[PDB]
Write a protein that binds this ligand. Sequence first.
Ligand SMILES: CCCCCCCCCCCCCC(=O)OC[C@H](COP(=O)(O)OCC(O)COP(=O)(O)OC[C@@H](COC(=O)CCCCCCCCCCCCC)OC(=O)CCCCCCCCCCCCC)OC(=O)CCCCCCCCCCCCC
Ligand code: BCL
Ligand code: BCL
Ligand SMILES: COC(C)(C)C/C=C/C(C)=C/C=C/C(C=O)=C/C=C/C(C)=C/C=C/C=C(C)/C=C/C=C(\C)CC/C=C(C)/C=C/C=C(\C)C(=O)O
Ligand SMILES: COC(C)(C)C/C=C/C(C)=C/C=C/C(C=O)=C/C=C/C(C)=C/C=C/C=C(C)/C=C/C=C(\C)CC/C=C(C)/C=C/C=C(\C)C(=O)O
Ligand SMILES: COC(C)(C)C/C=C/C(C)=C/C=C/C(C=O)=C/C=C/C(C)=C/C=C/C=C(C)/C=C/C=C(\C)CC/C=C(C)/C=C/C=C(\C)C(=O)O
Ligand SMILES: COC(C)(C)C/C=C/C(C)=C/C=C/C(C=O)=C/C=C/C(C)=C/C=C/C=C(C)/C=C/C=C(\C)CC/C=C(C)/C=C/C=C(\C)C(=O)O
Ligand SMILES: COC(C)(C)C/C=C/C(C)=C/C=C/C(C=O)=C/C=C/C(C)=C/C=C/C=C(C)/C=C/C=C(\C)CC/C=C(C)/C=C/C=C(\C)C(=O)O
Ligand SMILES: COC(C)(C)C/C=C/C(C)=C/C=C/C(C=O)=C/C=C/C(C)=C/C=C/C=C(C)/C=C/C=C(\C)CC/C=C(C)/C=C/C=C(\C)C(=O)O
Ligand SMILES: COC(C)(C)C/C=C/C(C)=C/C=C/C(C=O)=C/C=C/C(C)=C/C=C/C=C(C)/C=C/C=C(\C)CC/C=C(C)/C=C/C=C(\C)C(=O)O
Ligand SMILES: CCCCCCCCCCCCO[C@@H]1O[C@H](CO)[C@@H](O[C@H]2O[C@H](CO)[C@@H](O)[C@H](O)[C@H]2O)[C@H](O)[C@H]1O
Ligand SMILES: CCCCCCCCCCCCO[C@@H]1O[C@H](CO)[C@@H](O[C@H]2O[C@H](CO)[C@@H](O)[C@H](O)[C@H]2O)[C@H](O)[C@H]1O
Ligand SMILES: CCCCCCCCCCCCO[C@@H]1O[C@H](CO)[C@@H](O[C@H]2O[C@H](CO)[C@@H](O)[C@H](O)[C@H]2O)[C@H](O)[C@H]1O
Lengths: 174, 49, 49, 48, 48, 49, 60, 56, 58, 55, 71, 40, 39, 40, 39, 39, 39, 39, 39, 40, 39, 273
Amino acid sequence: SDVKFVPADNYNGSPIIPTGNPMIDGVGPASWAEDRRDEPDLTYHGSHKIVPMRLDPTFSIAKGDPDPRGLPVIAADKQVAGTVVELWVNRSEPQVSYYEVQLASGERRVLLPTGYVQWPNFGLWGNDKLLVKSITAAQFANVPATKRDDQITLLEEDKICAYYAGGHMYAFAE
Amino acid sequence: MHRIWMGTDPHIIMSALGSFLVGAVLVMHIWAYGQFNWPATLKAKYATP
Amino acid sequence: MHRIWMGTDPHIIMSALGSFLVGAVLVMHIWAYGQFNWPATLKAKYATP
Amino acid sequence: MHRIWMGTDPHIIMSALGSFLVGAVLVMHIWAYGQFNWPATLKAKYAT
Amino acid sequence: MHRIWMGTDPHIIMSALGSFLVGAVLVMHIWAYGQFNWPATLKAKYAT
Amino acid sequence: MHRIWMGTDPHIIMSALGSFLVGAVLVMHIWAYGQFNWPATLKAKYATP
Amino acid sequence: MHRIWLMYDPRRVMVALVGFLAVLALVIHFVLLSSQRYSWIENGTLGADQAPVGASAPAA
Amino acid sequence: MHRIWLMYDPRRVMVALVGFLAVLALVIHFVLLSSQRYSWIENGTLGADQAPVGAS
Amino acid sequence: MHRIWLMYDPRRVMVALVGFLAVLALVIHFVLLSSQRYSWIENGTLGADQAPVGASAP
Amino acid sequence: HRIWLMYDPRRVMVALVGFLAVLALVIHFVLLSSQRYSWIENGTLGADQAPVGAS
Amino acid sequence: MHRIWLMYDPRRVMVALVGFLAVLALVIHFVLLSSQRYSWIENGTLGADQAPVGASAPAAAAEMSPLPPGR
Amino acid sequence: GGMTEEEARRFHGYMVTGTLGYVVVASVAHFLAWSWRPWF
Amino acid sequence: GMTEEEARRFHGYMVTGTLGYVVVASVAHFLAWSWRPWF
Amino acid sequence: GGMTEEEARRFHGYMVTGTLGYVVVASVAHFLAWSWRPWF
Amino acid sequence: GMTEEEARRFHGYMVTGTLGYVVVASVAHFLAWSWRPWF
Amino acid sequence: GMTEEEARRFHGYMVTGTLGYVVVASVAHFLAWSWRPWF
Amino acid sequence: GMTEEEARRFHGYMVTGTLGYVVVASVAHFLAWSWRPWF
Amino acid sequence: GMTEEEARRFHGYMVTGTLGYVVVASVAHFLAWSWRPWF
Amino acid sequence: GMTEEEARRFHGYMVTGTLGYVVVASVAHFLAWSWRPWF
Amino acid sequence: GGMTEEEARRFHGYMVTGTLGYVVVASVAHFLAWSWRPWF
Amino acid sequence: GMTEEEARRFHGYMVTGTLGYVVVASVAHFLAWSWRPWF
Amino acid sequence: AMLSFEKKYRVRGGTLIGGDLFDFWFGPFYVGFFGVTTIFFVTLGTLLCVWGAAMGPTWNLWQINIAPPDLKYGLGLAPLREGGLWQIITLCALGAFGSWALRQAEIARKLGMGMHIPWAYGGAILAYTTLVVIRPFLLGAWGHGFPYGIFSHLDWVSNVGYQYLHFHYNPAHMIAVTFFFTNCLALAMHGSLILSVTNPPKGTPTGTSEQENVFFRDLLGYSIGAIGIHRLGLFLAVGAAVWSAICIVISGPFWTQGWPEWWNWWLNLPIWK
Ligand SMILES: CCCCCCCCCCCCCC(=O)OC[C@H](COP(=O)(O)OCC(O)COP(=O)(O)OC[C@@H](COC(=O)CCCCCCCCCCCCC)OC(=O)CCCCCCCCCCCCC)OC(=O)CCCCCCCCCCCCC
Ligand code: BCL
Ligand code: BCL
Ligand SMILES: COC(C)(C)C/C=C/C(C)=C/C=C/C(C=O)=C/C=C/C(C)=C/C=C/C=C(C)/C=C/C=C(\C)CC/C=C(C)/C=C/C=C(\C)C(=O)O
Ligand SMILES: COC(C)(C)C/C=C/C(C)=C/C=C/C(C=O)=C/C=C/C(C)=C/C=C/C=C(C)/C=C/C=C(\C)CC/C=C(C)/C=C/C=C(\C)C(=O)O
Ligand SMILES: COC(C)(C)C/C=C/C(C)=C/C=C/C(C=O)=C/C=C/C(C)=C/C=C/C=C(C)/C=C/C=C(\C)CC/C=C(C)/C=C/C=C(\C)C(=O)O
Ligand SMILES: COC(C)(C)C/C=C/C(C)=C/C=C/C(C=O)=C/C=C/C(C)=C/C=C/C=C(C)/C=C/C=C(\C)CC/C=C(C)/C=C/C=C(\C)C(=O)O
Ligand SMILES: COC(C)(C)C/C=C/C(C)=C/C=C/C(C=O)=C/C=C/C(C)=C/C=C/C=C(C)/C=C/C=C(\C)CC/C=C(C)/C=C/C=C(\C)C(=O)O
Ligand SMILES: COC(C)(C)C/C=C/C(C)=C/C=C/C(C=O)=C/C=C/C(C)=C/C=C/C=C(C)/C=C/C=C(\C)CC/C=C(C)/C=C/C=C(\C)C(=O)O
Ligand SMILES: COC(C)(C)C/C=C/C(C)=C/C=C/C(C=O)=C/C=C/C(C)=C/C=C/C=C(C)/C=C/C=C(\C)CC/C=C(C)/C=C/C=C(\C)C(=O)O
Ligand SMILES: CCCCCCCCCCCCO[C@@H]1O[C@H](CO)[C@@H](O[C@H]2O[C@H](CO)[C@@H](O)[C@H](O)[C@H]2O)[C@H](O)[C@H]1O
Ligand SMILES: CCCCCCCCCCCCO[C@@H]1O[C@H](CO)[C@@H](O[C@H]2O[C@H](CO)[C@@H](O)[C@H](O)[C@H]2O)[C@H](O)[C@H]1O
Ligand SMILES: CCCCCCCCCCCCO[C@@H]1O[C@H](CO)[C@@H](O[C@H]2O[C@H](CO)[C@@H](O)[C@H](O)[C@H]2O)[C@H](O)[C@H]1O
């Protein structure tokens, strides 16, 4: 099939039912804006807005805060999914947009938007691991990939965020 | 005439007929107690003067 | 006539019959105590003057 | 008639019956105390 | 009759029976004190 | 009959028995002091006029 | 006539109908219970010769 | 008639029914409790001839 | 009857039931304590013939 | 009882203790607000002197 | 009973306990200070027979009312 | 579940017996009640 | 959902439950009527 | 599940014995109550 | 979920607890009715 | 859960305790009757 | 987490604490009753 | 739902029950008429 | 969805349920009219 | 855990001994109380 | 985490400190009762 | 009808109570179990409002007035024409408003959104519940609720204010007003900045986050950031309703004098008594 979903029945207001894996197909809360422009977001001066922090030495951790790089990432099924290799920063409004995780099983590095992560005590103490409530460690293997690893397009941002957004509904689905 | 029962389940038939009769009988008795002055004559027979 | 029971669990039947009998008996007694002036004559017999 | 008890739990039966008897007996006694004027005559015997 | 106790726990049973007896006895005494005019006659005997 | 204590902890038994005994004894005294007019007669024996 | 159930889902027509009847029944009871003539909780034991009847003021 | 449970999953209907009956029962009691004729907490011991009537 | 507990998690129903009974008990005690006849903290020592009664028919 | 296998005792203990504290305070303040049991002001009155509601 | 500390963190229990006792102590003192009978700063030197007592009942004249007439 | 025709057949026998026994006891009760306080 | 056989089994209890509830309410109403009629 | 026909058979004989015993004791109660305060 | 045998034994405790509570409440009503009857 | 042979021994004491309790209560009532007869 | 043996021993002290609390409350009520009865 | 054969049996009993009911009702009316004629 | 056969089967229950309800309401109005007519 | 039958058998013997001792003392208390202020 | 080695020693301090506090409060109430009793 | 991107999102799931039984749409509207209860309470409450209008003196929209009962009824349900009808409508309103919040939670769950909107709306329900439930209960009569009528409830607000002689002096009211006024300024400011970068003067490039950050910093002297302004707006708008609930619940249950003489504590601080 090329159709990602079919109606539950023939009545007007009925829900749709996904055909394949909805997290991968992009159905329901796992869906993304498929028409979105496949180009990077730019700063006022025209540089790429979101970049890995090694690519701009202007950026550093605030001296009181832990650098997360090196820490283990704990998925929703409490397995280790990987470790944080790099941070990606927004150069227009300075913040960490994505953590970059080297997967523990397999070899790939995947992006992980902040705000899906949380610290065990919300930052207050004991900041030695990161929690990802939304998806299981096996599902980390299929997180969408950026076509370059120093730059991210607006479409790729949508796809990645949508993958974690679907997790609360679909991560434990059969 | 029996053929009217085809395609019906006898327990809903009896449940409906039973519910009708209980209704009809209670309506008729409570109506009748108003018209016939009974048990009011019974009560007056034994009520304390 | 016994074929009526074939669909039925016997405890469902005893529960329905048991409920109906308790309801009917209590209604009949509450009604009868109002009509026959008993236990009112019983209470009057032993009441303190 | 013994076959009626199949599929039941003895303790659920004895719980239900035990509770019915407690409720019925309490109702009957409160009613009977009212109708028979006892313990009221007992209390009147020893009151001061 | 003993096999009624099968599948029960003796420490539950004695807790249930013990709590019933305590309740019933206390209820019966406060009731009885009301009817029999005792200890009220005892109190009156030694009241000043 | 000692088998009633099987699987119980004697510290729990002595705590339960001890608390019960304190409760019963105190209640019985508070009650008895009301009925028997003592210590009220003791106090009246030594009170200043 | 039954083709109405091909147009509409019976499972939710039946919910809408039961809800409609519940609203309507409650409305009519509260309206009657607001009236004087049919304030049956306070005055239901009055016979029809004693039941209230509303009139306009005499146009004297 | 049992097929109503194929349309409506009975585990849900019991919870909705119990809820509806609970609210309905409470509303009826509170209506009665603050009427004059049936304010049984204050006047429940009055005989049927002594109980109020809402004559105009 | 026990298959009702296949329909519902008993560990939820027991919370829901205890919550309902606690609210119901508290409401009934408040209704009585707000009444005249059963305002027992102020008037509980009155005898049954001494306790208040609401108005009769005229 | 096996009931502690259903419900975490480490939670029930805190919930019970909190419930008892709330109930106990409510009853004390209800009594303290009453006439008959306003014990801080009138506690030394004898039972035949203490307030009683109207007959 | 010491296994209660395996369940509840002793270091944190002490902070909760002292906090509860401090609040309760202040609540009881201010309740008493607000009363008539135990307003001890102003009246602490009164003898126990001279300290205030609540009334066995309040009283009024038949035409007086504490509240205005309403509906 | 349900009852087989054999089970229904003997269940019916007890039902008939219980119904007739109950009506017999009620009949005695009515004879006594009529002798005590007749209602027509 | 449940099978039609399960539906027939459940429906039996639902009838006896409803009937028992209606029975108790019927007694409750006749007690209330005996105490203080509303018509 | 639940009692078997074996259990039901002997349970019934006890259940009947208990009920008969109760009716006997209650019969004496009514005989003494009638001797004390007749109600018809 | 629940096994059927677990549900059966739970149902036994649940019924026994329910009827036990109703018995305690019925005694409380007997005491209240004796103190100050409401009909 | 109590087993059939345990139930025999439990029942034996349970009957014995019940009878002892009833006997004590019977003497209590006989004393109470001789002190203040209630019929 | 929990075990049946932890449940057993926890239940033991929990029943003990409950009895102890109910004893103290019962004495407090009977002191209060003796001072100023509410019935 | 019932077959034509089931309908045949059910009809025979349904007819008989109806006739029995009407017969009893006829006696009831004859007695009521003898007791209190309504025309 | 459903076939015409399923639709036709449902329609039979729906029509008879509606008319049954209207009959019960008709009797309720007969009782109300006998108690207190509105015209 | 909890008492094994040998442990329970010691514990029971002391418990009975203490109960008897307590009841004996209370018996003297009531004899004295009765001689001081009889309550029937 | 907490050990049995810590827990049994800590329970000694808690119980002794609690009882010490309750004893000091008992003397404070002895003093307060002597100055202005509340019953 | 559906938005051109919508069909993709209309999946089952995220419901709280009803499972799949009510998990459907009706036009644009999502239904669900709390949709059903919403429409029930909305319909019942509205028809009882129309009945209250019918038995009242006029059909003029502004003048319709369903009043609460007299205070003499306490916490009982009054006769329906005497204000018991207001009490039934109040129960319907609570049922509708609660159902609306729970229905919003089902919609947010189905879309993978946070629960911020249901909880924000809870601030409005709190204020309503304070006016018609909590404050009347603390005062001991449902008759303290406000009447349902477009101008008659403004007569109630007027008279409640003057029950305290000079309600402007209520300290919680001063805070609540400050939140309402600051919210409206913040809304004008945020609305203007987004529109003015996305709609620059004709013949000018579309603006950027950096431009609105620069301008906002010139306005307030600090940069709030894109998430910060939405946190601020939520804080101000909901804080206004919470301080409103406080300001009315302290008036009567806790303070009963004029509000001006509450300020006597400030005049008597020992540094200047
Ligand atoms: C118009 C010519 C004259 C003009 C001069 C006077 C009026 C000026 C205002 C004109 C505004 C547009 C009116 C209109 O036709 O809208 C159609 C559109 C529906 O969406 P759509 O995208 O345009 O169309 C899609 C639809 O056609 C096809 O899809 P589908 O087939 O699935 O849709 C089902 C349809 C059925 O259509 C309708 O039912 C139309 C219902 C219109 C109701 C208007 C009531 C106004 C009076 C209320 C009096 C009160 C009754 C209680 O669509 C729907 O399901 C309807 C969805 C909208 C639901 C609106 C709910 C109420 C809105 C607020 C009501 C006012 C509250 C004060 O509905 C809406 O957008 C309505 C809401 C927009 C206005 C909200 C304004 C709120 C102002 C509040 C501040 C007041 C300060 C004093
Ligand atoms: C069990 C399968 C059938 C059933 C089969 C029968 C049979 C068989 C008989 C009746 C009869 C009656 N039924 Mg039917 N009936 C059912 C459901 C109902 C319901 C209901 C709401 O569920 C009602 C109100 C009625 C109503 C009635 C009365 C009109 C009538 C008198 C008995 C009685 O106690 O009735 C009130 C009943 C209830 C309130 C609840 C149902 C109680 C149980 C299920 C049936 C009791 C039958 C009883 C043991 C018969 C004794 C007679 C001897 C067998 C000779 N039936 C079910 C669906 N019904 C009797 C009759 O008219 O005989 C001439 C009769 O013999
Ligand atoms: C253990 C399994 C059964 C049980 C088995 C028995 C047995 C066996 C007997 C009773 C008896 C009685 N039970 Mg039962 N009973 C149970 C549950 C209950 C419940 C309930 C709320 O669930 C109630 C209200 C009752 C109530 C009653 C009374 C009608 C009666 C004795 C007085 C009483 O209340 O004692 C207070 C009781 C309770 C609060 C709960 C039950 C506690 C224990 C099981 C009661 C034992 C009573 C006595 C010591 C047994 C003596 C046996 C003889 C010496 C041979 N039982 C449990 C579920 N019940 C006796 C009887 O029929 O006398 C006429 C009887 O012989
Ligand atoms: C006052 O004004 C108004 C109110 C208006 C006046 C008018 C009132 C009116 C209209 C009243 C009408 C009353 C009425 C009309 O029908 C009343 C009808 C009453 C009836 C039907 C009574 C029937 C009773 C039957 C009983 C008790 C049966 C007991 C069965 C027993 C003991 C057997 C148990 C064993 C079994 C089953 C075997 C299991 C084996 C198994 C499973 C195996 O072996 O497999
Ligand atoms: C102020 O005056 C105003 C208010 C205005 C006046 C107006 C009032 C109005 C309009 C009132 C309307 C009332 C009304 C209208 O319909 C009322 C309708 C009431 C109804 C329908 C009540 C029904 C109750 C049914 C009950 C309780 C059922 C209980 C079932 C039980 C216990 C068994 C459960 C199943 C089990 C255990 C088996 C599991 C097995 C399984 C799973 C297996 O085996 O698989
Ligand atoms: C005042 O006005 C109104 C109110 C109107 C007036 C009218 C009132 C009316 C209408 C009253 C009706 C009352 C009534 C009926 O109709 C009342 C019915 C009463 C009945 C039925 C009482 C039955 C009692 C039975 C007892 C005590 C049995 C005890 C059994 C025991 C101890 C044995 C236990 C051991 C067993 C079982 C063996 C287990 C084996 C196992 C496990 C194995 O073997 O495996
Ligand atoms: C005033 O108006 C109203 C209130 C209306 C008036 C009316 C009131 C009414 C109706 C009252 C009715 C009361 C009643 C009804 O039945 C009362 C029934 C009372 C009963 C049943 C009392 C029974 C007491 C039994 C006792 C004390 C037994 C103790 C046994 C002991 C100590 C030994 C245990 C040994 C063990 C455990 C060893 C296990 C070994 C094991 C396991 C091993 O070795 O394995
Ligand atoms: C103040 O005065 C004011 C108020 C202002 C005055 C004005 C009032 C006004 C304007 C009133 C208007 C009223 C009105 C207007 O139309 C009223 C219209 C009412 C109507 C139509 C009621 C209809 C009721 C229908 C019912 C109950 C149906 C029940 C069906 C049942 C039980 C069967 C279900 C199906 C089954 C079991 C089959 C499953 C099998 C399957 C699936 C299988 O086999 O596959
Ligand atoms: C006024 O109105 C109302 C109030 C209404 C009037 C009515 C009042 C009523 C109804 C009163 C009823 C009272 C009552 C009823 O039963 C009262 C019952 C009282 C009882 C039971 C008293 C029992 C006392 C027992 C004692 C003191 C035991 C001491 C044991 C000791 C010292 C030894 C401990 C064990 C050891 C050393 C072995 C360790 C070995 C180990 C560990 C090993 O070996 O391992
Ligand atoms: C207005 O009147 C109204 C209000 C209305 C009336 C009503 C009022 C009501 C309802 C009141 C209720 C009161 C109440 C109910 O329970 C009150 C309960 C009070 C309680 C429980 C008090 C407990 C106090 C315990 C204390 C002080 C413990 C101190 C421990 C110490 C000092 C040890 C420190 C040692 C350490 C740390 C070393 C550890 C080991 C280490 C380091 C190692 O080993 O290394
Ligand atoms: C269901 C579980 C048990 C619940 C327990 C509570 C049940 C409630 C009471 C039901 C029975 C009431 O029974 C009724 O008691 C009242 C109490 O005044 C008696 O009332 C009569 O006798 C008493 C005692 O001599 C007098 O004080 C009283 O003035 C007189 O009216 C009635 O003659 C009796 O019929
Ligand atoms: C429910 C216990 C707590 C509240 C008690 C309230 C007072 C009543 C006490 C009655 C005595 C206890 O009665 C209790 O009954 C239930 C069912 O009825 C018995 O039986 C239950 O548990 C056993 C053992 O797991 C199962 O084999 C059985 O199928 C199940 O029904 C319990 O073993 C007994 O403990
Ligand atoms: C649940 C429906 C409402 C019942 C309300 C009780 C009072 C009304 C009398 C009901 C009597 C039986 O009513 C009758 O039942 C039968 C099945 O038994 C329904 O029959 C329906 O389903 C059957 C199959 O099951 C189809 O073959 C048929 O075409 C269809 O109409 C009828 O449509 C209805 O008229």
